[PDB]
C-alpha cells in the first residue's frame, strides 16, 4: 500500500494522449538535458531584453515539477499519502494556443501530439539558431528523433534508378496484410515493392507509364527510433486489435545503405485500449535505466503509466502481456527504440 518515487500526471479532463507522450519523452536519453539547455538560452535571452518559446518554458516547468516532486517524495514520504502526480495545465494551454485542435476536453491522437511538440521544438530551435548567428544544443530533434531516408525507384523497362533523399521522424508501419513480426512489418515498409496495374510509374526516360520497383533504405539513424504502428484498417474504419511480435533488440542493418553494427533496445511503448479508432484510453510503459539506492532498485524493470498511478512491472511480465499469445486489451501504438 505504498506509492513509488516515480511520478505521473493527472487526467485533467481527457488528457491521456499527452500524458503518455510526456512520460515517454521524459525518459528519452537526452531530451531533458537538451530542453534544459534551450531553456537556459531562452532565459538568458529574456534577461537580455514569445509564443514559440512558451512550449519550451512549459516543458521546463513540467520537468522541474516532476523531478522536484519525486525528490520531495524521497526525503518526505509521509508528506504525500494518496497519489503522487502533477498536472500539465500550462503545457496544454500552450499547445492549445499553438494548435487550436486541442481546444476543449476531447479525445486526440498521441502520435499527432508528439509530432506537434517535436516540430514546435525544432522550429523554435531553428529560429533561435538564426537569431544567434545574426548576433551543439541547436540540434535536439534533428539528432535524437530525425533520420534520413533513401527511396530508390527502378523502372522495369529501362532499369534506370532514381534516388530521392527524404527525412523521417517516425517509421510508419503496417500491422496486418491486405503471427507477424516487427521484421516483417519493417520489410513491408522498406523492402522492394513492385508498382503495377493502376499504380504505374511514369518514367521520364521512357516517357511512359511502366512497372517499377521501390526500395526504402536508411541512411542516417536517429538516437531514438519511433515506430508508428498502423493499428487501423479501412473495412467504415476499424482498429486492428491484434499486436505483432515486438523484439527487445532491433537491428536495421537489412534496410540500411551502409553496413552498421548498431542494435536498438526498446524502452517505451504507448498503448491504446479500446475497440474503436475514435475513442479509447492511452497508457505508456517505459524501461528505467538512469536518471539513493532505492532509485536504482528499479533498474531493468518496466514502469506502467496510467493517468496518475504508477506500477512497476517485470520485463518478462510486460513482454508476455504485450505478446499476442493472449488478448492484451491494450494494443501497442508507438514503439521507441534507443541506440545501444
Amino acid at each position: 500500500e505504498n506509492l513509488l518515487p516515480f511520478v505521473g500526471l493527472n487526467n485533467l479532463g481527457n488528457t491521456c494522449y499527452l500524458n503518455s507522450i510526456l512520460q515517454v519523452l521524459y525518459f528519452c536519453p537526452g531530451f531533458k538535458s537538451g530542453v534544459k539547455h534551450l531553456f537556459n538560452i531562452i532565459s538568458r535571452k529574456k534577461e537580455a531584453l514569445l509564443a514559440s518559446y512558451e512550449l519550451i518554458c512549459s516543458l521546463q516547468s513540467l520537468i522541474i515539477s516532476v523531478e522536484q516532486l519525486q525528490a520531495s517524495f524521497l526525503l518526505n514520504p509521509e508528506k504525500y499519502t494518496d497519489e503522487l502526480a502533477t498536472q500539465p495545465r500550462r503545457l496544454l494551454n500552450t499547445l492549445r494556443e499553438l494548435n487550436p485542435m486541442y481546444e476543449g476536453y476531447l479525445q486526440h491522437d498521441a502520435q499527432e501530439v508528439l509530432q506537434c511538440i517535436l516540430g514546435n521544438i525544432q522550429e523554435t530551435c531553428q529560429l533561435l539558431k538564426k537569431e544567434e548567428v545574426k548576433n551543439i544544443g541547436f540540434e535536439l530533434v534533428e539528432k535524437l528523433f530525425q533520420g534520413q531516408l533513401v527511396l530508390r525507384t527502378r523502372c522495369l523497362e529501362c532499369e534506370s534508378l532514381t534516388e530521392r533523399r527524404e527525412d523521417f521522424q517516425d517509421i510508419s508501419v503496417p500491422v496486418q496484410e491486405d503471427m507477424k513480426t516487427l521484421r516483417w512489418a519493417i520489410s513491408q515498409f522498406a523492402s522492394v515493392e513492385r508498382i503495377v496495374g493502376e499504380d504505374k510509374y511514369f518514367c521520364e526516360n521512357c516517357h511512359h507509364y511502366t512497372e517499377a520497383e521501390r526500395s526504402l533504405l536508411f541512411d542516417k539513424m536517429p538516437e531514438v527510433i519511433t515506430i508508428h504502428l498502423k493499428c487501423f484498417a479501412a473495412s467504415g474504419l476499424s482498429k486492428i486489435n491484434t499486436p505483432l511480435l515486438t523484439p527487445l533488440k532491433l537491428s536495421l542493418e537489412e534496410w540500411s545503405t551502409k553496413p552498421t553494427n548498431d542494435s536498438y533496445g526498446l524502452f517505451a511503448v504507448v498503448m491504446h485500449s479500446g475497440i474503436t479508432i475514435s475513442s479509447g484510453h492511452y497508457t505508456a510503459s517505459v524501461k528505467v535505466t538512469d536518471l539513493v539506492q532505492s532509485l536504482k532498485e528499479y533498474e531493468g524493470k518496466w514502469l506502467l503509466f496510467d493517468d496518475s498511478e504508477v506500477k512497476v512491472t517485470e520485463e518478462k511480465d510486460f513482454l508476455n502481456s504485450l505478446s499476442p499469445s493472449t488478448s492484451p486489451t491494450s494494443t501497442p501504438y508507438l514503439l521507441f527504440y534507443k541506440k545501444l
Partner: protein, 602 residues
C-alpha cells in the same frame, strides 16, 4: 470506366520511326523487314541494298507502344501486341488490320509462335497467357464471326517474355516472378518451374524439339536449361548489365546477346571462353533479328531505344584472348533512318498553343485547336522561347498532353474538357460580334464533323486535318475505338461510334446543348456600400468599372466617362481594363480566400 477522347497531331505519312523500335521480323521470301515501334506504327521495309528508299508501307491501328510482332502463315499474316491492351491481326502483304483481340486487361508484352501448329500465344502485365490458332483468326467482325480463347494459368506476377518451339509442344514464360514457367500448349498442362534467375527475364528461346531453353535476365546472366532434366546446364556471364535481347542460330550452338550495356556478343554455348564482340551500339539493345539466309548467319538487325534500325555484318566470325575488346565491325552495313521524338512539351498561357522540343533539339510551335504545326523555330533555347512567348492571360486547362509515342497526343476528359470559355477575338476567330467560345466543344465538333449524327457541319470556325486519328479510350490505356476524322461517315465507323462515343461528347456534339458557364465570386469594397458580387470568369475589368461608376457614385456617350473616372485595384495594383477576372485571380491575387477589388476616383 471513364472514357476519354484523344487525337494525335501528326503528318499524313510518317515514313520514319518517331521513337525506339521494340520488335523486328524478317520475311526471307520477299526480302522485307517489319519494325514495331514505340510510336505505335508498324512499318515495312525492303532489305535489297540497291533499293534507295526501303520504305514500303505503314501499318497504323495501335494507340500505344507496339511491344511484339510475329509473322505467320508464310508471311501472309502478322500479329501485333501493344500497350493499348490489344492484339491485332494484319494482312502483311497489304498492310491493313483484320481483327482486334481485346482479351487482355493490361499491356501485352509478349507474342510466341509455333510454326508447325500455326499457334500464337500472347502474354502481358495482366498475368494471362492466351493461346490463339491463327487459322481461326480469319475473322472479320464480331457480328460476322466470333472466336473462343484458351488460357494458361499459373503466373503470380507480370509476364515479360514468351517462347514456344516450332513443334508447338512447349511454351515457356519469363516474368518478374524470377522463375521460368513451362506449359504444354496442347493440353494447357503445367510442366515445370525453372529456378535460378535473380531478376526479370526479358528474353527466352527454345530449340526445335523444345528440349533446351536460353534465358536472358536483367541480372546479366544467360542460362541454358535442360527441360528434360528440369535443370540449368550452363550459365554465361558476358554482359555487365541486363540482357534484353537473345538470338540463336539454327543448330543452337551460338547465342547472340545484347542488352542495356550497348554491346552485342556471339558466345559459343559448348565452349563459352571463346566469344566475339560483334559491335558497340549507341542506345540499349531491345531486339535482334538474324538474317537466316545462310548456315552461318550473314547479318543481324538491331533495334534500340533510338529510331534507327541498323544491320551488322557477321562475316568474319570464326580469337585467342579470353575477353577481346576490339569489335568485329565498327560501322553498320545497312541503316534504316529514323525521326525525332517530341521529348519535352509546354502548354502556353492561352491554352491553345504548345512548344515542343525533340531529340534533335528542334523547337516547334503547335496549334492544338487546329491540330497543326504553326512553325519550326530551329535549335533555339527552349526556356528562352517559353519566356519570349509569355502572355498575361489565364485560360483553364482543358486538355492533357502525352508524349509516349514521340508525337503529340491530346486527351480530352469530361472533368476539364469544357473548362475553357474564351472570346472569338481572343481566340483568333471573328464573326460584327465577339461571341464566347468553348474550346473543347469546338474541338469535339471538329474531330467528328464527318459523323452524320452531328449534322443539321462542324463548328464553323476551324477544321482539323482529315487524317487526324481520333481515339476513344479509357483512363488506363484500354483503347475502345480508333478512327481517322474522315472515316466517321462509313457504316462500320458510324455503328462503332454509336456504341463507343460517351454521352458527355454526345450532349455537346450531337444534342448541340451548351456547357455551363463558370463563375467566380468577388468582393468589391471602397479604397481610401460593400456588397458581394459574382460574375463570369471572363468579364473584363471594364464592366466592373462600369458597374462601380454608374451605380455607386452616379450623382456625350455614357460609357466614355466610365473608363476615365474610376480605377480598380487588386492588392495595390491598378488593373488593366481589358483584363479578365480569371487573370486577376490567377496572377494579381496571390493571397488566400475570395478575390477582392478596390476602387478609387481618378
Amino acid at each position: 470506366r471513364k472514357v476519354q477522347v484523344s487525337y494525335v497531331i501528326r503528318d499524313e505519312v510518317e515514313k520514319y520511326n518517331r521513337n525506339g523500335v521494340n520488335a523486328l521480323q524478317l520475311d526471307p521470301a520477299l526480302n522485307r523487314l517489319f519494325t514495331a515501334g514505340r510510336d505505335s506504327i508498324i512499318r515495312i521495309w525492303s532489305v535489297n541494298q540497291h533499293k534507295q528508299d526501303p520504305y514500303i508501307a505503314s501499318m497504323e491501328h495501335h494507340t500505344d507502344w507496339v511491344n511484339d510482332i510475329v509473322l505467320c502463315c508464310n508471311g501472309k499474316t502478322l500479329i501485333s501486341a501493344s500497350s493499348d491492351t490489344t492484339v491485332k491481326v494484319w494482312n502483311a502483304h497489304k498492310g491493313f488490320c483484320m481483327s482486334t483481340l481485346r482479351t487482355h486487361k493490361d499491356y501485352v508484352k509478349a507474342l510466341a509462335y509455333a510454326k508447325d501448329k500455326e499457334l500464337v500465344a500472347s502474354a502481358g502485365l495482366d498475368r494471362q497467357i492466351f493461346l490463339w490458332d491463327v487459322n481461326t483468326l480469319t475473322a472479320l467482325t464480331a457480328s460476322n464471326n466470333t472466336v473462343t480463347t484458351s488460357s494458361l494459368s499459373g503466373n503470380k506476377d507480370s509476364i515479360y517474355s514468351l517462347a514456344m518451339n516450332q513443334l508447338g509442344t512447349i511454351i515457356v514464360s519469363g516474368s518478374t516472378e524470377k522463375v521460368l514457367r513451362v506449359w504444354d500448349p496442347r493440353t494447357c498442362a503445367k510442366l515445370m518451374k525453372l529456378k535460378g534467375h535473380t531478376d526479370n527475364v526479358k528474353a527466352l528461346l527454345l530449340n526445335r524439339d523444345g528440349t533446351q531453353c536460353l534465358s536472358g535476365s536483367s541480372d546479366g546472366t544467360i542460362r541454358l536449361w535442360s527441360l528434360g532434366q528440369q535443370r540449368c546446364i550452363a550459365t554465361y556471364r558476358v554482359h555487365d548489365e541486363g540482357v534484353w535481347a537473345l538470338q540463336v542460330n539454327d543448330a543452337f550452338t551460338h547465342v547472340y546477346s545484347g542488352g542495356r550495356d550497348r554491346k552485342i556478343y556471339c558466345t559459343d554455348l559448348r565452349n563459352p571462353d571463346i566469344r566475339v564482340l560483334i559491335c558497340e551500339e549507341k542506345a540499349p539493345v531491345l531486339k535482334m533479328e538474324l538474317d537466316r539466309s545462310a548456315d552461318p548467319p550473314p547479318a543481324i538487325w538491331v533495334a534500340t531505344t533510338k529510331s534507327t534500325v541498323n544491320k551488322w555484318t557477321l562475316k568474319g566470325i570464326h580469337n585467342d584472348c579470353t575477353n577481346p575488346i576490339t569489335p568485329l565491325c565498327t560501322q553498320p552495313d545497312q541503316v534504316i533512318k529514323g525521326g525525332a521524338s517530341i521529348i519535352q512539351c509546354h502548354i502556353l498561357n492561352d491554352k491553345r498553343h504548345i512548344l515542343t522540343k525533340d531529340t534533335n533539339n528542334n523547337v516547334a510551335y503547335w496549334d492544338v485547336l487546329k491540330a497543326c504545326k504553326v512553325e519550326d523555330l530551329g535549335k533555339v533555347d527552349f526556356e528562352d522561347e517559353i519566356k519570349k512567348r509569355f502572355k498575361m492571360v489565364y485560360v483553364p486547362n482543358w486538355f492533357s498532353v502525352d508524349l509516349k509515342t514521340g508525337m503529340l497526343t491530346i486527351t480530352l476528359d469530361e472533368s476539364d474538357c469544357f473548362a475553357a470559355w474564351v472570346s472569338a477575338k481572343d481566340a483568333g476567330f471573328s464573326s460584327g460580334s465577339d461571341p464566347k467560345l468553348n474550346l473543347g466543344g469546338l474541338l469535339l465538333q471538329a474531330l467528328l464533323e464527318y459523323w452524320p449524327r452531328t449534322h443539321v457541319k462542324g463548328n464553323g470556325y476551324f477544321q482539323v486535318p482529315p487524317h487526324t486519328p481520333v481515339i476513344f479510350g479509357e483512363a488506363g490505356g484500354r483503347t475502345l475505338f480508333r478512327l481517322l476524322c474522315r472515316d466517321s461517315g462509313g457504316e462500320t465507323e458510324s455503328m462503332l461510334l454509336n456504341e463507343t462515343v460517351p454521352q458527355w461528347v454526345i450532349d455537346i456534339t450531337v444534342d448541340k446543348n451548351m456547357p455551363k458557364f463558370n463563375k467566380i465570386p468577388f468582393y468589391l469594397q471602397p479604397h481610401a456600400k460593400k456588397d458581394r458580387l459574382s460574375a463570369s470568369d471572363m468579364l473584363q475589368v471594364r464592366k466592373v468599372m462600369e458597374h462601380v461608376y454608374e451605380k455607386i457614385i452616379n450623382l456625350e456617350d455614357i460609357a466614355v466617362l466610365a473608363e476615365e473616372k474610376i480605377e480598380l485595384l487588386c492588392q495595390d495594383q491598378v488593373l488593366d481594363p481589358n483584363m479578365d477576372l480569371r487573370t486577376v485571380k490567377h496572377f494579381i491575387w496571390k493571397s488566400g480566400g475570395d478575390l477582392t477589388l478596390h476602387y478609387r476616383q481618378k
